[PDB]
RNA sequence: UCCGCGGCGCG
DNA sequence: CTCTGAATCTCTTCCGACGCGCCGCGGGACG
DNA sequence: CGTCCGATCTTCGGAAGAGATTCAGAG
């Protein structure tokens, strides 16, 4: 909903999708560039948590 | 005999106490970098949390 | 409708965090270990072969690396939601149901 | 009857037990457990009776 | 006076925007508690993509992974307490919370070569 | 303008 | 002796009327 | 003008259901 001002009426769904997609593409960037094994472990853990 | 009342004074005291513990944690963190008299006691103090 | 391509497998929470442990009862092993395996803190064996480990052998981090030192040839242990998916792939309904 | 069910007979092991109970999954240490016990009931920063 | 092993690297999870602050906070704790021998250095990855125009100009600071940092230590419960006591940072990552696992040095020197390859000929 | 939460009141 | 095993104890979880009206709130720290 | 998100509030029944225990029994 466009609110009169610099911000709009946003539910939590869009923010959650933004967080999850950011997590996913950051994990993809890590794995593609051959990230160290320990990093991708906690990365996948936190993606699953998200 | 075991139920009391508290008023605006107690609420102000408790909120002010919480603000002070937060700000003193911040002040201790910044004073850990303490050094010889190149600082004047206003920049360490931050009124924003209070 | 659209979709997002998850780079890594993840477990559906409802099939995990419910009073009936559908994943646990389908895998016949208590939900305590599935949580640990899914949240990346312990290892599970997936068909370790003719070794001293069982099909559903739960392992810790220290024991996993020790076993890998001696049994890195064909013993394979995978860890995580991808491991859970792979383990679920490697089972058959008919033999299990007739055995039960 | 309480002492019969008691799993410990020494101060160190009881401190270990309470330290593990209140915060699960943490390294049991004599110094950490003793400090936490003293900060729960005898340090004015956290515990305070009016 | 007999334990002189390969001095280890572990990983510490740091909140976004405090990475340099976490690094200098650990440096400050090292220089304050005066166990500068037990503790080592911190290797946080940095690379510099440079573009003359297009919003941000002449420099753009990006890094391989923001959420984590690599720090040099030895195995010590006192060191564990010192790292955990640092504010604005969460702590170690490993198989168990009590003792995190080390990192294989093969990918360590692989990422050393990677940062050497990306980071060269400044400006 | 449109969304959500909290508080109060009415039935 | 021992494994079983029915019973017992303990730990986790989803739940709590239905309409209406009014008002207040709706980030925030940092490169 | 955009980018990206660490400390402890603390005390209900009321069941329902699942998990852990236990001790007891024919022997």
Swiss-Prot record, chain B:
Name of this chain's protein: DNA-directed RNA polymerase subunit beta
Shown segment, full-protein numbering: 449 to 498 of 1342
Q: What does this protein do?
A: DNA-dependent RNA polymerase catalyzes the transcription of DNA into RNA using the four ribonucleoside triphosphates as substrates.
Which species is listed as the source?
Answer: Escherichia coli O157:H7
Lineage: superkingdom: Bacteria
* Quaternary assembly: The RNAP catalytic core consists of 2 alpha, 1 beta, 1 beta' and 1 omega subunit. When a sigma factor is associated with the core the holoenzyme is formed, which can initiate transcription.
**Phylogenetic placement of the source organism:** Bacteria, Pseudomonadati, Pseudomonadota, Gammaproteobacteria, Enterobacterales
By sequence similarity, the record places it as follows: Belongs to the RNA polymerase beta chain family.
Curated annotation (Swiss-Prot), chain C:
Cystine crosslinks: none
Which sequence ranges are marked TM in the entry?
Answer: none
What does it do? DNA-dependent RNA polymerase catalyzes the transcription of DNA into RNA using the four ribonucleoside triphosphates as substrates.
Family per similarity comment = Belongs to the RNA polymerase beta' chain family.
Q: How does it assemble?
A: The RNAP catalytic core consists of 2 alpha, 1 beta, 1 beta' and 1 omega subunit. When a sigma factor is associated with the core the holoenzyme is formed, which can initiate transcription.
Which protein are we looking at?
A: DNA-directed RNA polymerase subunit beta'
Organism annotation: Escherichia coli O157:H7
User: Could you read off the lineage of the organism from its UniProt record?
Assistant: Bacteria, Pseudomonadati, Pseudomonadota, Gammaproteobacteria, Enterobacterales
According to the record, which residues of the full protein are present here? 102 to 201 of 1407
Curated annotation (Swiss-Prot), chain E:
GO annotation, cellular component aspect:
cytosol; transcription elongation factor complex
GO biological process assignments: DNA-templated transcription termination; regulation of DNA-templated transcription elongation; ribosome biogenesis; transcription antitermination; transcription elongation-coupled chromatin remodeling
The entry's keywords = Ribosome biogenesis, Transcription, Transcription antitermination, Transcription regulation, Transcription termination
Family according to the record? Belongs to the NusG family.
In the record's own words, the domains note is: The N-terminal domain interacts with RNAP and the C-terminal domain binds either to Rho or to RpsJ (NusE). These domains are separated by a flexible linker.
Job of this protein: Part of the processive rRNA transcription and antitermination complex (rrnTAC). The complex forms an RNA-chaperone ring around the RNA exit tunnel of RNA polymerase (RNAP). It supports rapid transcription and antitermination of rRNA operons, cotranscriptional rRNA folding, and annealing of distal rRNA regions to allow correct ribosome biogenesis. Participates in transcription elongation, termination and antitermination. In the absence of Rho, increases the rate of transcription elongation by the RNAP, probably by partially suppressing pausing.
Share what the entry says about its subunit structure, partners included: Monomer. Interacts with the transcription termination factor Rho and with RNAP. One NusG monomer forms a stable complex with a Rho hexamer. Binds directly, but weakly, to the core enzyme of RNAP. Also interacts with RpsJ (NusE). The rRNA transcription and antitermination complex (rrnTAC) consists of RNAP, NusA, NusB, NusE (rpsJ), NusG, SubB, ribosomal protein S4, DNA and precursor rRNA; S4 is more flexible than other subunits.
Question: This protein is called what?
Answer: Transcription termination/antitermination protein NusG
